[PDB]
Amino acid sequence: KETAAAKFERQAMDSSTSAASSSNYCNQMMKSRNLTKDRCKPVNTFVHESLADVQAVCSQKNVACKNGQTNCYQSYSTMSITDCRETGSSKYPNCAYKTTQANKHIIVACEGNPYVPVHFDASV
Ligand SMILES: [Cl-]
Ligand SMILES: [Cl-]
């Protein structure tokens, strides 16, 4: 299996672009990251920052996770992100997504050693 850390990297990181400059970004990335393989993953967020900057969030503001756990951290600054969400008329395997580009603080759950992000809790 994929480790938790690697799975986060694959689903969330997109350091190759500064921001989504197309309405087709999500359709293309969701497919390329293999997120539409067995089904259409309904929601996903990609972060357009360096991996090092994202990992560093694990040393930032400690806050509660939506589930109540306390291993969540909120980034001190805003980051470039792209929210990908399935449209109402999307059907596997013809997955279709709405692309929404924004600048928001990210909140992630961190774990392990090294202590890195394992799940994307939300953005503010
Ligand atoms: Cl790993
Ligand atoms: Cl994969």
User: For position 91, which CATH number holds?
Assistant: 3.10.130.10
Q: How was this structure determined?
A: X-ray
Sheet strands side by side (includes 43-47): 43-47, 79-86, 97-104
Resolution in Å equals: 1.7
Domain of residue 44 covers 1-124
Q: For residue 12, report the distance from its CA to the centre of ligand 1, in Å.
A: 14
Gap between the terminal Cα atoms of the chain: 31
Q: For residue 31, report the distance from its CA to the centre of ligand 2, in Å.
A: 10
CA angle (74 as vertex; 71, 80 as ends), nearest 5: 135
Q: For residue 4, report the distance from its CA to the centre of ligand 1, in Å.
A: 7
Q: For residue 93, report the distance from its CA to the centre of ligand 2, in Å.
A: 17
Q: How many domains does the chain have?
A: 1
Contact at 8 Å (CB) between 48 and 80?
A: yes
N residues, the chain: 124
